[PDB]
Symmetry: C3
Subunit: 213 residues, 3 copies
């Protein structure tokens, strides 16, 4: 066979569309005049004004919040506001050049079985893309998350992924990665159970935090 003309199966289109808007978020603290990285996570640039969604846990008790873009630009971020109920926080960067923004299709309904990519900075390795599916789109009854509206996914999520993007194969934002199941019942480590705040809610909470705080 000659595969030179065949095309490898790929979600690179989604990567090129979405990944430039996903940032590395650095929670710096003083411990001396010199600042040190205390926590790191990810964030998503939502619009051209410089508003960024991240996770509240990532940015709590920060003396300085740093945002690093995949294009090499580094900004100091301002905390616009945070919501403990949803674990979301909004940041603001002041930029000249123009900013990459996350694709959002407000009319897209996420479906269970949809291929998704998680985009973030696990263990400070640098931007990482992982692939899974939507395992669930919320819950009707009471469940161990205590919430009714999480997207669940088996796209590998690690420490440093929090605040980052979950996108479909088109690069459209599905959710903001927030949690990974860790409760081992009998020695066994949970595998491929992760949670994201649905994009519709993330949009709404951002808008309210921008205007109110």
């Amino acid at each position: 066979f000659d595969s030179t003309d065949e095309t490898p199966a790929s979600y690179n289109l989604a990567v090129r569309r979405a990944a430039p808007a996903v940032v590395n978020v650095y929670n710096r603290g003083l411990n001396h005049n010199q600042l040190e990285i205390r926590t790191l996570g990810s964030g998503v640039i939502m619009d051209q004004r410089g508003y960024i969604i991240t996770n509240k846990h990532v940015i709590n008790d920060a003396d300085q919040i740093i945002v690093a873009l995949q294009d090499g630009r580094v900004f100091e971020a301002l905390l616009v506001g945070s919501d403990s109920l949803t674990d979301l926080a909004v940041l603001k960067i002041n930029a000249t050049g123009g900013l990459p923004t996350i694709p959002i299709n407000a009319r897209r309904v996420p479906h269970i079985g949809d291929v998704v990519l998680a985009i973030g900075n696990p263990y400070n390795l640098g931007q990482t893309i992982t692939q899974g599916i939507i395992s669930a789109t919320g819950r009707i009854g009471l469940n161990p998350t205590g919430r009714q509206n999480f997207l669940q996914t088996d796209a590998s999520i690690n420490h440093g992924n929090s605040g980052g993007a979950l996108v479909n194969s088109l690069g459209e934002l599905m959710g903001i990665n927030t949690l990974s199941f860790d409760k081992s019942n009998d020695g066994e480590t949970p595998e491929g159970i992760g949670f994201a705040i649905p994009f519709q809610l993330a949009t709404k909470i951002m808008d309210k935090l921008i205007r109110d705080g």
Copy 2:
């Protein structure tokens, strides 16, 4: 503008297969509480359900919960320790969703598969992997998969992108080497074998 583009998805398989995958509760006298939980697959309109033997062992009461909200008390038809399969029976009156079965489908290594079950009682969960290997003390024959399988997935379904049953999820490899956790190594009883075991158990033979 991706408005008319179509997201890559295995939702078709989900719609076809997931309604037939049930939550299995091993309940024990407390009053009455949940002891072990797993999953099960509704195999036919008669109300016969395949599950895992370790899920239902020593139960005072076996409860089966469907995704449509119906809850039934299940009766233990029989179990097979050699294959770790058990058959349950619920009230078939009122119509039941059943698992798609293609008896002529040959499972191939590299086939995309979805695992369907109730891990950690989170509610029905779909995970995606591929068939990693086939034909895997013990003389058992398994399909191996990297579709994430967790405590509570046992007795549940492994299906292909068409929603056709490939196997019954049974085991997750956890044998560490130099102090490390295995990732993406899971085992399912092939559907042909499971069907055979179910038939024998129903006959009581």
Copy 3:
């Protein structure tokens, strides 16, 4: 008309093309406690690179071997000779002598691996037998300094376990992307973080070791 031809989504084509060329590699040492018998000390994977019987594996799989055994998926078993190893890249080259035709790994020298490409990892984790796992290319290298200490690793979330080392990472076409080498294993258990030597570097090192042995 009653039997239609719908087929499930599958990477079986890549499997059929690539998997025959991925071998199980056994590092065997003789012990002086049981009748000078050879026993397995380490196991990994390897990739048959050309018809002559040259095989890429990881250096750490074949370190201190009294005997290196190579097992093919068709059932053939060979004693391999160590051609050479490179500690800088953790690659080793083996040589087998076969009468029949050997299966070889598909290589497209003009293929550029892209982040998001579907990949399959092929190897022998925990001596279960050849195992195929599926992920994507998570990253194709790093510009900045990072915890791996290196700049050219392909990162992947295709599940990699003990025994996968020296084995193949291929795309959906069966074309070699890299040689699986490392897993991020200890700090929280990391999930879906694995590393492969890019096929271009693996090919350059192999040719060097075949020519010189160094």
